[PDB]
Ligand binder design. Sequence first.
Ligand SMILES: NC(=O)C1=CN([C@@H]2O[C@H](COP(=O)(O)OP(=O)(O)OC[C@H]3O[C@@H](n4cnc5c(N)ncnc54)[C@H](O)[C@@H]3O)[C@@H](O)[C@H]2O)C=CC1
Ligand SMILES: Cc1cc2nc3c(=O)[nH]c(=O)nc-3n(C[C@H](O)[C@H](O)[C@H](O)COP(=O)(O)O)c2cc1C
Ligand code: SF4
Lengths: 55, 430
Amino acid sequence: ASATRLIQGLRNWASGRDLQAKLQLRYQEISKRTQPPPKLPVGPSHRLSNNYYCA
Amino acid sequence: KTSFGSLKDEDRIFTNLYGRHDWRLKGAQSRGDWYKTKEILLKGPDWILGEVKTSGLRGRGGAGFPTGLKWSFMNKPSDGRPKYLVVNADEGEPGTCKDREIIRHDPHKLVEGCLVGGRAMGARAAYIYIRGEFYNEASNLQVAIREAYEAGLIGKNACGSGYDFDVFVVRGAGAYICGEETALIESIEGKQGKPRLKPPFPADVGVFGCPTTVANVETVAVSPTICRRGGAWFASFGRERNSGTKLFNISGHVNNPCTVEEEMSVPLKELIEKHAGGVTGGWDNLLAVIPGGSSTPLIPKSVCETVLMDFDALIQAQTGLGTAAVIVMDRSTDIVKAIARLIEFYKHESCGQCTPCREGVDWMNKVMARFVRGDARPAEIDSLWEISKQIEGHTICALGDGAAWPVQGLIRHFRPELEERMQRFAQQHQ
Ligand SMILES: NC(=O)C1=CN([C@@H]2O[C@H](COP(=O)(O)OP(=O)(O)OC[C@H]3O[C@@H](n4cnc5c(N)ncnc54)[C@H](O)[C@@H]3O)[C@@H](O)[C@H]2O)C=CC1
Ligand SMILES: Cc1cc2nc3c(=O)[nH]c(=O)nc-3n(C[C@H](O)[C@H](O)[C@H](O)COP(=O)(O)O)c2cc1C
Ligand code: SF4
C-alpha cells in the first residue's frame, strides 16, 4: 500500500482492475489482537422453574 | 343446621379444662369421671366400636382419620402376640397446647379413655407416650394413675369386669418427630426417633412388633364420654363428616390467647372475636392466620372472614385443620421472618432419615433466610415452590408435608410481598 503512484498506475493498468480498492495484504483496518473481555449468554435451559429434564 | 358453634357448658366434654377444680380422684368422681365404666367394659369391643363409629369421631391428632375405623382394624384375633394401645401425648407442634392441658387438668378422663380404648380393641396395656418437657405434667399424671390403681379402676380386674389392664407413662426426650406415630413407636423401643414406612401400619406391626394403635390424647379422652352420652349426641355437633367438639388454641396476636372447647364447624371470626377478644387492633388489623398450627398453610384475612373451622371447609380453603391451633398474625408482622423461623423450626426438628426432608428442609431454610433479607431475585420464588413440590409426597412421614405446606401457603398468598421485598433490596443495596 506504500507503493508509488507510478508503480500503482502501472499495476492498475496491467491488471485491468482497481487493485487499491481490494488489497490482499491486510493493514490497520483489521481487528485488534488484544480484545475486550466477552460475556457470553446462556441457553434457554438455564431456568429455575418448569425446568425438569424429562420435558 | 346452618350455623355452628356457641356451645353451652352442659355439653362440654372437657369440664375442668382450666384447672379450677381438683384434678384428683375425689374431684374426678364429682365430675362424671370413672362413672359406669364397668357397663362399658362388660359390653365387649364391638359395641364400643359401634358407638364410636356412630359418633363420627375423626382423628383428633390432625389428619382426621376415622377413629372408629382406625380402632376397628385391631378387631382381630391374636396369634400369640398381645395387642397394645399407645396414647400420643407428645404435642410438639407450635400453636398446639391442648393435650398438655388434658394431661395437667383432666388426667382421670385420659386414664378412663385408656381403659375404654383398651377394651375396645383388646389392647393389653396403655403406653401414654408423654413429652419429655412435660415433667410436672408427667408426675401429675402419675399421681392420678396411682389414684386410679388404688381405687381398683385400672390394674388387676379393672373396674370389676374380669379384664386386666395397665397404664404406663413413657417420657420422651424433647423431640418433635417423636410425635409422629411410627417414630413414637421407635422411641418407645429404645432407639432413635426415626419413622417407619407404611405399610406395615401400626395395627399390623406397631410397638415391639405387636399390633398397636397410636391415638391422640384428645381422641382418647372423649371416647368414654362418647360411650356414656351416646354416639348421636356427640355426632350432632359440627357438619356431616365433621362430628364432635374440638379444643381450639387461639394464640399469636390476640388479646387473650386461650384454649377453648368449641363445636366443630364454628366460624373463625366468631371464635376469635368471642372467645379470644379479637386480634390486637381488631378485625381491621388482622393480616394472616395460620389456621391449625405450624403444619398447615396460612390463609389471609379475606378468606378468614367466612371460613368454618372444621376439616372439610379448610380443605376447601386449600389448607388443613390439623390441631385446630389458630395462630393469629396482625398487620405489623414481617410474615416472611415468621415463616422462615418456622422452617428453621422444621429443620431443627427433623430426624434426618430420608433424603428429601434431610436435605430440602435445610435448603428451604437457607432460601427463606435469604428471602427475609431479600437477598435473591423473583425467579427463586417459584423454584422454591418446586422444592416444596419435591418434598411433598417424596418422604416417609408427613413432616415433609409440614415443612412444604407453609412455604406453599406463603408463596401462594404473598408472592407480591416477596417480589416487592426483593426489588427494594436490589434498589437500596446496589
Ligand atoms: N397432632 C399434632 O401434634 C401434630 C399433627 N400434625 C398433623 O399430622 C398430619 C399427618 O399425620 P400422619 O399420621 O403422618 O398422616 P395421616 O395421612 O396418614 O394418617 C393419620 C392416621 O391415619 C391412619 N391410617 C391411614 N390410613 C391407614 C391405613 N390404610 N391403615 C391403617 N391406618 C391408617 C394412621 O394410622 C394414622 O394414625 C398432618 O396433616 C399434620 O397437620 C402435624 C404435626 C403435629
Ligand atoms: C411430624 C409429625 C409430628 C406429629 N406430632 C404429633 C404429636 O405430637 N401429637 C399427636 O397426637 N400427633 C402427632 N402427629 C400425628 C400422628 O401422625 C398421628 O396422626 C396421631 O398421633 C394419632 O392419630 P389420631 O388422630 O388417630 O389419634 C404428628 C405427625 C407428624 C407427621
Ligand atoms: S422426611 Fe424427615 S421426618 Fe420423615 S422419616 Fe425422613 S427425616 Fe424423618
